[PDB]
Every structure is written in structure tokens, then in C-alpha cells.
Chain length 400, copies 4
């Protein structure tokens, strides 16, 4: 275990190997960690657990730290499998140990473990749990951030906010604190996490943070459920979350597509050229969805003021990877972004119009589409390049 | 080169390595071949070329077989990149050599090569091209089988049908003829090809074959553009195409899904059990679309009387791989098949209803959906197992 | 659960999703199953368990079949994680239940579970365990087939041989018996399993089967730990094991390589041509190790009389995937096979000689190597094709 | 095209999609570019070409910039396929155009293209080529940096060094110059390139740079063949090459392994713990070679003072991915690094000793190995953790 602060002990688990989260929809290229915390005052409190894969390691490591019978309270901020996966194994040893959680957590815990006989304690915002030595736990409900059962736990005196998933990131390192790791890699994992997971709940982020700030609770450290502990200027991640929640966008355009004979690819490259020579302010990224990291594409979409999506017509519909990606974007609900569909066709086409409509369904403000037949020649590439010019002028943040 | 029959020489190319066709939407697990043919009578005729990757090998191998200036006619049955990719390199050496093709082929050839100065000869069904020694080529238009430019070329006397893509398969072998290869692997590649490529054009297959049969043309061999040459009972593949085109289905049910915590997986397995114990006649296959070969899933769908598709609710929509697969099935237009959507959810759900509707859009006759919350317990698995029973009884080909 | 025969119940688990075994060194393209059996006579005996992934399901399904306290004996034929993974979870409920296994199994069970306080019973070949109703279990030691702890359990009366890994295969199907599944797929998975796993233990196969046959024990069914139960002509898989163990080879040559600019690939294709035109009897397979299924290559190697391995020179050594594959072949110990190293180089080369030596280390009888500089021209390809001729004539099983 | 400086025009090609170089041994996660340059003074000089994939685009784009007959000289700094792939297509239009290159380049050009009838001009260090307007090209031989044919071309007046592969990186961006792109991403791609490609030629780097500096030639820009053009403080990449060539290492330890039951993984994690609590200065990275990016592991190895490699015993040999990686490291020739082999075994083992020996063959100074049986218990993990302590104390750059 690792000492977080005073009697707060990190009893979590590092995961150097993990590459797949949420099925295969989240790629953790830099591993992850599952942070659990054991507070040892007059009362002994365990906060969250770890992933199911390390259930047996978690209990044994917990035994080495403390006798399991001496654990007074268990706090579950969130009942996902990567935080409550090792709960059943633990409760098999100490079944009478009370669990403090939200009302919705009772539904989610019993939903997976099927053990309603456990001693649950419903907590709501403002409720306190005394642990002795002048210290107490304060619970703060955060529904749909990013689950209905989600909440945070604050420890007075030590001024530590156990925020669970919030302000966390999938980043595995031997060092525990934020000032001990690579800042660039840390920022990348943080933004990647928010973009792919927390984007559709952005409307709830700012009012919830504003509510918490009103409590006037001092914050020395922010101990999340994933990655580093924020101890050096810990509110820096809170400020990033405030920026990212306000329909975040940079002067940036992301282009992604799928192609069978690179005809649409040629269109994509030509569009990008037109943009660059019209608006030097705009940063442009190009991706082949069949050949690229999906989460990286989505992170760029999150950072972009607008996107262009390319697809060829395949059996009168669009290419499935493009279709799948558009479906996911519809769930993420990007805001204040604009889009334009493009692609090549053989005869009757139809996929480009089909794509433009589904992009509109995803919440994008649509501009005119760009269509081309077979392989674009020199004249056709001019029209594609011209299309990029028109997009740049329309989506300009400022004149010229 | 290899002797097909008499003065017919296979001057094509084997591809032991190829794994990706049509971007990444067709997996060739057993490689492929690109069959080109050189007929040497009084006239010298080249029929089709090969993939663009082997353009330089093709011309050189062609030089070793014959002086390029001695090539009298070039026949293009189909102007795709895996058949007309090496055309530009070839025509760069013999630009005055006439090209015989369909009217639509002029649009597709010029669409990729951008060389309209070539000497094109529009051919239609019934047209002949004499090559001497009492032999002639007969052209047969086959629009939308599977491209608008598609046609077949028949050689009299030798009774050889150059069918291009039709009756072909992606199967690489040192032996050229069908009776020289593994029959099981051959059948698998044939059915895989039809299911993933030719399914939406099934309505055009039977009338076109019936039209060709009316010509009363003897068939000794069928020389396709991919895989083996059919010489031993060559009409066996024609009969398979007739069977596969008639909205083909077996007493079979395919179940596929994507899952994040295996909750939907548990539902899938429970459904399958209910089916097996209700209708022993039904063959059941189960796939995880994130962990399986996509084309294999589609081949099973093609063979199935009905399917069940599973997805969890992710950001109020369905999982993208399921969405992508449903989009592709909408293009393939499966017929006389039935479907049922299922999956697990956390709170409000909605993905299952969303999936059922899109399956209906794909042409499936929909049965009732199956929904479950979180991880299915013993009682919940009973309902899933019961759902499989109801599906089996409804989709029964015969009573009991 | 499923009735195997009389009071024998299959209480195992199907795995439709599994694709990776032994890390990533075995690909199960058709899933797998983990077969556990519950015999209910006067005594109740459980034979083996399942993979750790389905541990909670295994125990729960076992409860639905019988009260856990009514389980009299537990038989562990083999203590691997895919057979003894759910042991700890089970023994946590019934710790006093005796375990019957080999002496080496005590080391392997305690090696993973760390529960030496369990009540182990060492069994040896010929030892019996009465279960009532005139029936008894007979244990047969099979060390290094394929583990030191490996054994088989025979049930008298019902004449059922519980062979564990032996005669098994990774094949998932809703039907349990061999006469109920696809015979071609069954054969493929059986041979694939033997080639990649049981090849180095081939010398031990024949004497052990001969020893078992000497017991004159009637065999009605063979219940393995993976895949189908052999009930219809169960000795068919025994004869296959006898054939495969005798340094199995067909008139077949497998060629595999890795390449950076397809120079070595061009050599590979030319070699294959030389073989085919010299010995038409020989079947030839070509693989790119970077683009193919590794286990399929090894299955072909197992079936081949000889192989040719290709590599280019990379930093004065060979390409890593070739190095890795040769290392694995060194462990598999193929017998009575011949080999030839080939490949392209830029200047000083050396990788081909390095490869030839390591192939000799793997047990292959080496023929002359083939070297070429850069991209092989027409003259160079003649030498490559000529090399295939020389190899074909040398490795001929019969003249011409 | 893009203006580099004055009459120097970038006529290269961006590659947003490329992910595989040298077969599959180099992963370009951020794409790449192929830089070609057209100098238009009194004479017109083309410097290098692009990859074969963009050959038709290269020639066409070149036509749009200038009439091909007006091209006076062609300079080939390096005849690899990603620099000379489009040479044949170009020379097919202007065969009489002279080619300036090293003596070894004649062998490498003719080795691939097979056109020795081309007009080659052998150049050596110090040789000049006048292009008018007071400007001239100066050639500098750089054999085995990183090919025998490799050289650089310097343009007087404009003070531009065409370094080809040297100082380049695989990084695709719409902006051409180094001060216009993300500095962190640029540094990562630069170091990644050197570590995986230029490491074994490090002994040649420093003397060659020293030789060039002796020429006292002003360097305003460095135009490479891959990635950005260095115009803003161009000597920053030169200093990095000087640092990286001097047997570069940081206070860092990289641990990588392959595992079948995570037994070796448990050992790896325990070792890392022992190191971290013994020497807090040391940075530790852990990788599973079957689940990680191979090039990233090698970049970490390059940056590390020492490594620990893990493998289990599989058929009396080591796991193939470990074998393959060690083979590649043997070619890369890392210097002044130390190593320790570890891993789990079932009975007789042997793979750990086998690995330790091959690590010694790769040039690592070996410390004692670490062996464990089956799954490491609490006592075994103590020894593993203790091993990390012993390694940390031994490999310390400074006391404590
Ligand atoms: C499998 C397949 C299906 C196709 N279906 C259609 C279609 O339904 N309508 C159409 O106009 N073109 C169709 N085409 C032609 C392509 O749209 C055309 O080749 C396009 O220009 C190539 O796009 P890409 O290279 O950018 O992927 C199809 C092509 C293929 C290979
Ligand atoms: C990223 C993510 C998004 C989710 N979105 C929703 C949602 O929008 N509505 C809902 O009811 N449940 C949602 N859930 C909960 C899952 O649907 C629930 O855990 C389900 O039972 C698990 O399905 P599976 O394990 O079969 O994939 C979400 C879960 C995750 C991980
Ligand atoms: C990264 C790299 C390293 C190389 N190292 C060597 C070498 O050490 N010795 C040599 O003779 N050639 C070397 N070469 C040249 C190749 O061996 C040569 O290009 C070969 O003909 C190509 O083989 P392939 O296309 O079959 O992969 C190297 C090439 C590359 C790209
Ligand atoms: C396919 C296979 C082959 C094995 N071969 C050997 C062997 O030759 N010698 C040995 O001592 N153990 C052998 N073992 C046992 C492993 O070394 C043992 O399970 C080890 O502790 C697991 O290592 P890992 O989980 O780190 O991969 C083998 C295991 C498997 C699955
Ligand atoms: Fe979560
Ligand atoms: Fe989480
Ligand atoms: Fe086609
Ligand atoms: Fe085709
Ligand atoms: Fe086993
Ligand atoms: Fe097994
Ligand atoms: Fe190079
Ligand atoms: Fe290069």
C-alpha cells in the first residue's frame, strides 16, 4: 500500500497491461489503475474496491494492511465492475459490515451481486459519517456523473475529496501523485477520458461543481478511482473540467473516413489542402477509421469546431465503420459543432446524403455535402479543394 | 502461365498473403487469386487483368508469354481494381490496342484511369468477336451482377465461359482446377463470397442464368476471375447460385451481440439453451461481434432462417459495432428472415427498441424484444431461456 | 446440464467467445468448452471443473444440480486453470471434500491455489474408487500427456473414459456428442490441437495407449475436458492420435516467411513454382507469418514432410517473427522433417545462414540454403524456381 | 507544393494512414511523410522521390510544378522504396535524365529497378554540382547511416542540408516546418525513430557530424526525407542525435515479459515494487509484449539504464514473442545496459537460463536471474520484491 496523507492509505491496484475498457470501445494505451482507499482513524473506512480481475489480490493485500474484521464502514461511491468488482469476494469475509452509498447504488449493487441481504446505508448530499479524532466523511450526490449511483466522499481535516471517476484518468504509473508523473501524458489521458466518457453529461458538470464550491470545503487533495492523486494545485483538473464542459472546441477541424479504393481518401486530402490555404488558424487532423484508434478520433472531434466525414456508397448504404462511429457520436452528443459529409460513388450513390442526415441526427449543424464519381481527376480534386475553402470561410471563428 | 484448355492460357496472379478486400470489410483468410486469360488462335485475345499490386509482374509475365504488340484484342468483363488495376501499365505499352467492354464499362474504366483516348468497343448481349480457326467470342451483359459494367465472355468450340466475378471465390492454391483442391474449403469460400457480396443482387441472378441457359451454349469449363477453374461438373456452382439466390435459408438461428460486462452475453447463452431444448432441428451459432470474424457472422446470417441481435444501452444508443453491422445488413438486403432484439440496460435503456427498429429497416420480420436489467439472476435467466423457447416455436419450419 | 450416459451429467461450460489460450499463443477461432462431469450413484463424484472466468457460474450451476454437501469425491485429472480454475471457489463451500489426483497434481494444485490443508488422495495406475451400484472409478496415470500431473479416470459398467485433455479439441457447439456436429470442423480442431500442443509428447502417446488397451476395458464413450463427447465410434480419435504420433507427415511442403519489401516473398512464390512443376504430387502452402494465423502455419508444418523458411537480413539478424516461430518449433520438436532456409539481403547478409542453423537446432534435416540480393530479377527468379526443383527431387517420397 | 526557401519547393507526399513500415516491424501511429524537393535555379534539380504507393500522384504533381523535360538532374541520397519507389515511373518519362548518387546506390538502385542503362553519376564527399546563380550542390557520403548508399546533399547560398533519413521522423502534419507543429509529438517521433532504427549505427553518428562541422558550412535549414523541415534552431535535432548516439540512457528501468497465466506478471509487478522502494530516482515501465506496442518497448529500452525480461517455460523453451524481441535487440546492439532474466516454471523449467544467455548475446551485462514455481505466494513475492531491491542497489548510478 501507499500513504496518501496521514492515515489515508492507497490499497488499490495498478494495471500495466489493460488495453480494453467497455468491451472494446475504450482503448487504454497507457494502462490504468483502480484506486481504493483505507482510512484508519478511530473508525476504519474502506472507500471503493478494484476491478474484478484483481479481486483475490485486493482482499489479500487488504489483509496485510488490516484485519478485515476491524473494518467498520465500507463506502461505495460507484458500483461499476472496475470499482465494485471485488466487493462480493470481500463481503464473503465480512458480510455484516455496513455499506454507505446512494439510493441508486442499492439498485446497481444488487443488480450485479444479487446480495440484497447486505446492510446498506442510503446517503444523500450533506450527510455525515464520523470516523473519530475530529474528522468526518461528507457525502455529495452526483447523479449521472457519469452514472445514476455516482457520488463523492469528502474527508474533513485532511481535506481530501474522494471523487471516484470524476477528475480521473486511465494512466498507470509507479508514482501516485500528479506532480510525480509526465504532465503531457497525464493531460492526454485526462482529455481522452472526458471526451470519450463524460461528453454527454457536460450540462451537469458545471452546476454540480458550482454546488460543491458553495459548500466551502477546503481541498488539499483529490483522490480519484483511476490514475494519479491530485495534490499539487489539485483544482487544475477541476478547471479543465469546467473548460471541457462548456461545449469545448478549438480552432480545429477533424476529417475522418473509410474507403475501399482510396477515392474518398483523395477527396479527404484535397479538402484539407483547401482549408489550410484559406485559414492558417485552423488545425487539421485526418484519420482512416479502419486504420486508426477510434478514441483518438473522438478526442479530436471533441477538440474540433467542426468535422468532415467521408464514406463511399456500399450496397446503397454507408460503410459500417462510419455508421458505427456516427451512432456513437449520437450518444456522446457533441455541441456547437458543424459538419459536412463527403465521399465517392460508382453510379446512383446515396451514402453521402444518408451520412449527412445521420450527422444532423447526432447534433451537428450541417453544411453542403461534397460528392464525386469514381477516382477524382485533376478537375475533380479542384472541386474538393474548393470545398475545403468554402468550409474554412464558413466555419471561421473570425473574419479572413 | 498455366494451360486452361488448348490455346487458353491462365496468365493471372496468386495472392497467398491478402487478408483485406473492400477496405477491411471482406477478410480473405485463405488468400485469393486474380485470373487473367490469354487466348491464342488466329487472333490473340487478353481477357481481364489482375490487381494493382501485381501490375508490374503481370506485364512482365505477359511479355514472357507473348510479344505485347501481337495482342489483337483486350476484353474487360469488369473494370474493378482487382481486375483492371494493371490496365494502365499495360496500355502504356500498347495504347492502340482495342478494348471490348460494356457501355457502362467505358464510364468505369475512364472513371479510374482517366484515359478516354483509348479505343473502346461497346458490346452488348449476342455480339460476336471472331478470333479465327472456327472459334468466336460471345458477349453476355450482366448489369448489377455485381456491378453495372459487369458482363461475361463465352468462347465457342472450347466451350469456356469467362464469367469474371460470377461463380468465383477468394481461394489461393497452386492447383488451378476445382477437382484438384479441397472441396470443403472450396465450398466455404464460395458461400462466403456470395453471402457477403452477391446477396443484395439475388433477384437478378435467376433471370440472368435462365436467359443464358436459353442461348443453348455448351459449357465445358467456367473460368472466373477469382480462384479455381470449374472443369469437373462445372454447372455445380451454377446450381449453388440458383439455390443461394432464392432467399436461401436453413433450419438455423444466428445470435450475435456486443457486450461490456457480459450481461448481454449471459442473455445470449440463455436464449440459445431455450431454443435447443424446444426445437432440436435448429442449428445455433453465437458470436461476439467485437471478438469474431464479421464476414463469418454474415455468412451464418445468410444461412439462417432467423437471427437474434444483442446490445447494451450505451449513452442512450446501441453499441457501435452492432450499429455498423446492422447498417451493412441493410445494404445486403436479406430476405424471408425474422429477427428479435435483446440486451441489458442500467436505467432508462432504449438501445434494444432502437435496435429492433433498425433491424426492421434492414428487412427482418420482427418478433418481440427481450430486455433485462444489469446482470441477469436465476429468475431473469429463466425469462431469457423462455424467450428462446417462444422464438423457437414461432420460427419453426414445421410443427413441434 | 446434459445427460452423458445414465447417471453421468455434463456440468461444464461453453465458451463461444474465447479466442486466446496460453496467453496469445493458441487461437481458438471456433471457441471452446470446459467439460466437467457429475456422477450420481451411491456416491456423488465430480470430475474436473472449468475455467476461472466461469467460476461463479460453475458453482451456481452445480448447486442447481445437487446440494454441494452431497458431493462425496472430487477427481482432478489435470490441474490447469481451464480445468481447476473454479476449484478454489468450490472448495470454499466444501473444504472437507476429498480430492483424488496424481502425486504431481498435489504440487500443481498447491502451486496455484495455495491451500495445502485440503484433503488430497494420491492415486496411481490401477487404483480404484468405489461409487456404489456395482460401479467403480479406475485411475490411469499419463505423465507428460501433456502435463506431469495428467491422468485419466475410467468408469466401469458405463464404460466411460474421462480422458481430460487427451482426445479433446477446442470446439464450441450446443450439441455435446461427436455425431451431432460438423465432422470437418471437428477434424480440423482436433488436428489443430494435437499439432500445436501434443506434438512434442508424441513418443509417449503410443506406449500409453498400448498400455490402456492391455487393460481390456470396454470403451463406450470418451468424455474429454474440451469439446465433444465421443460416443459414436469413439475409437476413431484414438486411431488419429496413433497416426499423428508416428512422426506424422503427408506429401506436403509448407513455405513461410516474413518480408519488408516482398523480395523474400518473390523468392517464396518462385520456389513453389519449381516444386509444383517437378513433383505434382506435393501439396504446397505459403504463409506470411506477419499476416497469417500462427497456429495454422504450425498445423501445416505438422502435416508437411518438409518446410522452407524465408527471412531478410535485418540489422545483421533475422526478422523477429521468424525468430519467434523457430523458437516455438524448437520446443514442439518436429520429427523426420527436412528444411531449407532462404531470403533476400542488401549487402553482407547473414540472416539466412543464421536461420538455417536454428532450423537445424529445431530438429530439421537441413538442405542447401537459397540467397538473393535485393529484388530478384528474371534470372534470379530462375534460380529460385530451380531451387524449388532441387528441393522437390530431394524430398521426394517416391521417384518422379 | 510548398515553398521551403526561395526556389526550393517541397514536392513530397503526406501519409495520414500509414501504420506499418518494414513489414510490420515499425508502427507509425502518427502517420508519416515522404519529402521530395525541387530546386529551380539556372538548372532544375529533383532530390529524392516518394513511396511507391504514391507514384502516380508524385509524377502528376511534379508535372503541375514543372515540365518533366526541364528537369536537369536527379539526386538520390538513398535508394529505399520510400524514397526511390516512384523512380521507375518518373524515369519512364525522362530516361536520359542523369542520376547523381553514391557508388553503393548504383547497386541498390539497379538492385530494385533493374534499369542499369540509366545514366548514373557516382559522387563522393566534397564533389560539387553547379546549378547556377552562384549556387552549387555539395555531396557528403554517410555510409551505413543508415544504409551503405546513404548520403546527404548540401545547397550553398540557401544553406539547406538535405539529410534524407537523418534527423527525420515519421510524423504527418499539414504544416511543414518544425516551429509549426506540436513539439512534444515531434520529440516522441524523433526519439522513436532513432531508437528503433539508428541505434546500431550510433558509433558512426558522432564522427560523421564532427566531419560535417569541419566543413564550416552554414546551416539555415535541414530538409529531411521524413516529417518536418527544421528551420527554427535546426541544430536542436543534431544535438539530440549527439546525445542519443553516446550510448544514451536515463535513470530508468524497463520491464517486459510474456505470460500464459499471469504468474510471470505477478513476478514483474513485485520486482517493480522492490525497485521503487529502494531507489525512488529510478523510473520504471512495465510492458506485456503480447499486449503492447513493440516499438514503444524498444524506445523505453533505449532510454533505460537496464532491463528485466520475463518469460515462462513453454515446451522447454521460451515464449516466442520474447524470443523474437531478444533477436531484434541483438541486431539493435544496445550499449552500456544491464539485464536480468526472470519467469515462472512448472517443473524442470530452463527458459529463464535460456533467456539470460540470449540477453548476454544481445550485449547486456547480466545480473542474477529470478526463478519461481507456478503462482508466487506471499513468501515467493517477497523474494521477487527482494530481487528488485538487489537489482536497484546494483544498477544505481549513485549511492542510495
Ligand atoms: C462492394 C461494393 C459495393 C458498392 N456499392 C455501390 C452502390 O451501391 N452504389 C454506387 O453508386 N456505387 C457502389 N460501389 C462503387 C463505389 O462506391 C465506387 O467504387 C467508389 O467511387 C469508391 O469509393 P472509395 O474508393 O472511396 O471507397 C460499390 C463498390 C463496392 C466495392
Ligand atoms: C459507457 C456506458 C454507458 C452507459 N449508458 C447507459 C444508458 O445510456 N442507459 C442505461 O440504461 N444504461 C447505460 N449503461 C449501463 C449498461 O447498459 C448496463 O451496465 C448493462 O446492464 C450492461 O450491459 P452489457 O454488460 O451486456 O454490455 C451504460 C454503461 C456504460 C459503461
Ligand atoms: C531496417 C533494415 C535493416 C537492414 N539490415 C540489413 C543488414 O543488416 N544486412 C543486409 O545485407 N541488408 C540489410 N537490409 C537490406 C535488406 O536485407 C534488403 O532490402 C532485402 O533485399 C529486402 O528483403 P525483403 O524485401 O524480403 O524483406 C536492411 C533493410 C532494412 C529496411
Ligand atoms: C503449453 C505449456 C507448456 C509448458 N511447458 C513447460 C515446460 O516445458 N517446463 C516447465 O517447467 N513448465 C512448463 N509449463 C508450465 C508453466 O511453465 C507454468 O504454468 C508457469 O508457472 C506459468 O507461467 P506464466 O503464467 O507466467 O505464463 C508449460 C505450460 C503450458 C501451458
Ligand atoms: Fe465508471
Ligand atoms: Fe472507472
Ligand atoms: Fe468485383
Ligand atoms: Fe473481384
Ligand atoms: Fe492442459
Ligand atoms: Fe485443457
Ligand atoms: Fe531508409
Ligand atoms: Fe525513410
Amino acid at each position: 500500500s501507499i500513504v496518501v496523507k496521514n492515515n489515508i492509505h492507497w490499497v488499490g491496484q495498478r494495471d500495466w497491461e489493460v488495453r480494453d475498457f467497455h468491451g472494446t470501445e475504450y482503448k487504454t494505451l497507457r494502462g490504468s489503475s483502480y484506486n481504493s482507499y483505507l482510512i484508519r482513524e478511530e473508525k476504519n473506512v474502506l472507500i471503493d474496491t478494484v476491478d474484478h480481475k484483481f479481486s483475490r489480490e485486493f482482499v489479500q493485500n487488504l489483509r496485510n494492511e488490516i484485519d478485515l474484521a476491524d473494518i467498520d464502514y465500507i463506502v461505495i461511491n460507484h458500483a461499476e465492475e472496475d470499482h465494485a468488482g471485488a466487493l462480493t469476494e470481500l463481503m464473503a469475509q465480512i458480510p455484516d459490515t455496513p455499506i454507505y452509498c446512494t439510493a441508486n447504488a442499492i439498485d446497481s449493487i444488487n443488480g450485479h451481486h444479487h446480495h440484497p441481504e447486505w446492510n446498506f446505508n442510503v446517503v444523500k448530499t450533506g450527510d455525515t459519517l464520523d470516523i473519530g479524532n475530529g474528522k468526518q466523511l461528507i457525502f455529495v450526490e452526483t447523479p449521472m456523473l457519469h452514472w445514476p449511483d455516482s457520488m463523492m466522499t469528502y474527508l474533513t481535516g485532511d481535506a481530501v475529496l474522494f471523487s471516484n471517476d470524476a477528475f480521473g484518468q486511465h494512466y498507470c504509473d509507479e508514482h501516485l501523485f500528479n506532480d510525480e508523473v509526465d504532465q503531457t501524458e497525464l493531460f492526454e489521458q485526462c482529455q481522452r477520458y472526458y471526451a470519450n466518457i463524460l461528453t454527454p453529461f457536460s450540462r451537469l458538470v458545471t452546476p454540480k461543481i458550482t454546488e460543491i464550491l458553495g459548500f466551502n470545503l477546503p481541498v488539499d487533495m483529490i483522490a480519484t478511482s483511476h490514475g494519479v492523486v491530485w495534490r499539487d494545485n489539485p483544482t487544475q483538473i477541476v478547471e479543465l473540467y469546467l473548460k471541457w464542459a462548456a461545449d469545448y472546441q478549438e480552432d480545429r477541424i477533424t476529417i475522418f473516413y473509410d474507403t475501399m479504393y482510396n477515392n474518398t481518401r483523395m477527396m479527404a486530402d484535397a479538402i484539407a489542402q483547401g482549408i489550410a490555404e484559406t485559414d492558417p488558424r485552423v488545425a487539421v487532423k485526418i484519420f482512416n477509421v479502419a486504420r486508426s484508434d477510434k478514441n483518438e478520433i473522438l478526442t479530436n472531434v471533441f477538440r474540433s469546431k467542426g468535422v468532415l466525414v467521408g464514406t463511399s456508397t456500399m450496397n446503397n448504404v454507408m460503410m459500417p465503420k462510419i455508421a458505427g462511429l456516427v451512432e456513437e457520436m449520437t450518444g456522446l452528443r457533441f455541441r456547437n459543432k458543424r459538419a459536412s459529409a463527403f465521399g465517392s460513388h460508382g453510379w446512383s450513390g446515396g451514402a453521402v446524403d444518408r451520412l449527412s442526415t445521420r450527422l444532423q441526427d447526432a447534433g451537428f449543424e450541417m453544411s453542403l455535402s461534397l460528392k464525386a464519381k469514381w477516382r477524382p481527376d485533376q478537375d475533380a480534386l479542384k472541386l474538393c479543394r474548393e470545398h475545403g475553402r468554402e468550409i474554412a470561410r464558413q466555419w471561421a471563428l473570425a473574419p479572413l
